[PDB]
């Protein structure tokens, strides 16, 4: 029921589907399966105004092993932690995601836009 | 502004800002004046354009920090006026969640 | 040199069937095996050098053409023609008789084709690029155990490594044309800017250059951290050849860079650079 909800875009309808399901395990799959395509689709919005509860920490692993996963400039992850940190008041917690992205990209990159975005990581902070 | 052109306030105000205009006293209202742009609930400007805006605004305030003392800062107007730096960085952060989700919903 | 210059076979090329099909080694069925047999057979060398430089050559156009070949391929008589040449040492006959002479600095398609050579061994002999790195270790074990004895070293010794280290140091302090084929082993992965290497992608992400130079600066990237005694020297020649040129300059400043800061590896005379 949640596949076919991605399926046809219902993404409000595919969070209540999510909702309803019992177990974490299953939960945390199809957590995965809907940053994964909601990401592809540029479907960012559903991804902030989603009002989790007792599944953030859930929501928070992924994103964080995902950002451990994922290229600095072809995906925004740690952005994405980001505003969520904002969207749940998460000062001290956006500023470490600022400051842990910004020594990942000391380390990764040399570049020029590189250093804009080191600059930029350690001031939001 | 009073016809809002926001992004042309936004030019002139940045163009100014690194000209790094008028003196101690008066970089008091150069701070002052980003609260519209900051009151903006609807916005066109780009994710970089956000990045150099706050980039000068704290720039700004490290170096007001350090105009007033070079270590320390003395101006009777300065702490409250701190206060009104955290509420307005305050928004102006969520306003910069809403900027870039709505800018990678652009790309869309 | 040039009408072997066969440099497009190391890996797969678009272009490389179409240069097959208008190379004159190919539309000639004879010709791979007629070189390849009257070279296998005996003939007069008068230079050992350059007898040991023929081997070679034909044994690195063999080497490329077995990767897309099947009938005018050949394989078998490379390791011993490789071995000949390795064993007269080749490399210094180049170094001296050629390279010495500046005879070899009247155009620049000398330089381009012995850099191509230089880029062409190593990448096909991958393995014996690894025998002789190891066999050069052995070789520093052996005049170590001989210095703790206070004895020489045993039976001979084969520096070929050393005696490309020598050879191409000394290459690249000879161009007038300033080629800088030496910015070849010198890739923009590496993490290195200037003010007017914005061009480059060293301040815009990412950049991979072709897997054979890929693994030829690469190898030197590791050698930057793995070192012999014995060898410490002629790498010192590959040290000041690159050292010649202000942006190959930058460069290597940037890899002793990373060979600078603690470590445990650029402390030690063996097993990296003291």
Known sequence: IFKHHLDMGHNSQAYDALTQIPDTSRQLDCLRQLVVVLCE??????????????????????????????????????????????????????????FEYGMRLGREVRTLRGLQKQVNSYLAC | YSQEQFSEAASLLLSLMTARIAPCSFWLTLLLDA?????????????????????CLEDRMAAKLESTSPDEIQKQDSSIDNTKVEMLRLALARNLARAIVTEGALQE | ????????????????????????????????????????????????????????????????????????????????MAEIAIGGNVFLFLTEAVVGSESFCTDEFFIRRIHKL?????????????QLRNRAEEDARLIQ????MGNEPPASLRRDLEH????????????????ELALEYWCPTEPLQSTSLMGSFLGVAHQRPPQRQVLLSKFVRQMSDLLPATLYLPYLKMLRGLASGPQCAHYCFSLLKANGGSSAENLQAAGGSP
């Open chain 3, 145 to 148: 155990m001989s210095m703790q």
């Open chain 3, 1 to 80: 040199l040039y009408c072997l210059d066969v440099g497009f076979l190391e890996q797969g090329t678009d272009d490389r069937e179409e240069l097959m099909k208008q190379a004159s080694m190919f539309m000639d069925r004879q010709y791979i095996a007629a070189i390849h047999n009257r070279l296998q057979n005996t003939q007069p060398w008068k230079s050992p050098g350059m007898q040991a430089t023929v081997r070679l050559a034909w044994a690195l156009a063999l080497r490329g053409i077995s990767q897309f070949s099947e009938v005018l391929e050949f394989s078998e008589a490379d390791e011993p």
């Open chain 1, 41 to 98: 689709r540029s479907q960012l919005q559903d991804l902030v105004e989603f009002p989790y509860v007792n599944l953030h920490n859930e929501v928070v692993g992924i994103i964080e092993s995902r950002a451990r996963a994922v290229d600095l400039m072809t995906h925004n992850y740690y952005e994405l932690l980001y505003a969520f940190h904002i969207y749940r008041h998460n000062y001290r917690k956006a500023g470490t995601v600022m």
């Open chain 3, 164 to 179: 490309l280290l020598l050879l191409i140091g000394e290459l690249y302090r000879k161009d007038p044309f300033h080629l």
């Open chain 2, 35 to 55: 609260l519209p742009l900051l009151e903006q609930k609807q916005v066109i400007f780009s994710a970089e354009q956000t990045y150099e805006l706050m980039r």
């Open chain 3, 118 to 130: 230089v880029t062409d061994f190593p990448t096909l002999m991958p393995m014996k690029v690894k």
